[PDB]
Paper text:
We describe the development of a biologic that takes advantage of the proximity of the N-terminus of bound [name] to the three-fold symmetry axis of the spike protein to create an ultrapotent, trivalent [name] entry antagonist. Therefore, we sought trimeric scaffolds to fuse three [name] moieties and leverage the inherent symmetry of the spike trimer to maximize avidity. Thus, we determined a trimeric antagonist fused to the N-terminus of [name] would require a short peptide linker and would be less likely to form inter-spike interactions. The collagen VIII trimerization domain is significantly larger than the collagen [name] domain (44.7 kDa and 19.3 kDa, respectively), but more importantly, previous studies reported that collagen VIII melts at ~45 °C66, whereas the collagen [name] domain melts at ~85 °C (vide infra). Given these observations, the smaller, more thermally stable collagen [name] trimerization domain was advanced to develop the trimeric antagonist.
We then sought to prevent the dissociation of the collagen [name] trimer via the introduction of intermolecular disulfide bonds, despite the high reported trimerization constant (where 50% of the trimer is monomeric) of 56 pM49. Cysteine mutations capable of creating inter-chain disulfide associations (i.e., C®-C® distances less than 6 Å and absence of obvious steric clashes) were identified: G22–F'26, E31–V'37, and G(-1)–L’5. The parental construct yielded ~1.7 mg·L−1 purified protein (n = 1); the disulfide mutants, [name]–V'37C and G(-1)C–L’5C constructs, yielded each ~1 mg·L−1 protein each (n = 1); whereas the G22C–F'26C mutant only yielded ~0.05–0.2 mg·L−1 protein (n = 2). The formation of inter-chain disulfide bonds was confirmed by X-ray diffraction studies. High-resolution crystal structures of the [name]–V'37C and G(-1)C–L’5C mutants afforded clear electron density for the disulfide bonds in both mutants (respectively). Furthermore, the thermal stability of each collagen disulfide mutant was assessed by DSF. The ‘wildtype’ collagen [name] trimerization domain produced a calculated melting temperature of 84.9 ± 0.2 °C. However, two of the disulfide mutants (G(-1)C–L’5C and [name]–V'37C) either produced very low or no fluorescent intensity up to 100 °C. Considering the high melting temperature of the “parental” collagen [name], we posit that the melting temperatures of the disulfide mutants exceed 100 °C. Given the poor expression of the G22C–F'26C mutant with our trimeric [name] constructs, we proceeded with [name]–V'37C. The introduction of [name]–V'37C to the trimerization domain of T3A (termed TD3A) afforded a melting temperature of 51.1 ± 0.03 °C. Combining the disulfide mutations, TD3A with T3AD (termed TD3AD), further increased the melting temperature to 56.5 ± 0.01 °C.
Numbering used by the authors:
A (entry chain A): -2 to 53
B (entry chain B), C (entry chain C): -2 to 54
Write the structure that this text describes.
């Protein structure tokens, strides 16, 4: 059982130019609207998140 | 404040035979269905994911 | 295109005492309630998780 991780970008614009480099099974975070995805074998799945709050 | 990470397996079958060894607080990726779980102290929680798309829109 | 990770705390209160040290884009696991959050700039988004089960369902 291998390991992956989480890759980060500040903006969607920057992410879209580089996301092809992300290996399968890694997570992808885009800071501007606090979005999270996971990379699949042949696509992407968006993680479902509740609304942003200052506290948990 | 310690760190965990993400563990991955290619198939559900492969995962189910080894996943008990994953420590609490790690994420678990199963490539076959492109699914994610979180390891709890006593069990697992499945992450809700939207359907697969070609790009992260 | 940097990298982040996952960090672990036992409780919401323990986490909150350290959260200023957590940058945006890190995932946060809280063992009490087996909950997962993502750090945003100035806050958190809770990951939607299904119910805890003994096996990955």
């Amino acid at each position: 059982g291998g390991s992956s991780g989480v890759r980060l970008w500040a903006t969607r614009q920057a992410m879209l130019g580089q996301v092809h480099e992300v290996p399968e099974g890694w997570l992808i975070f885009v800071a501007e609207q606090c979005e999270l995805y996971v990379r699949c074998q042949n696509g992407f799945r968006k993680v479902q998140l509740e609304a942003r709050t200052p506290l948990p």
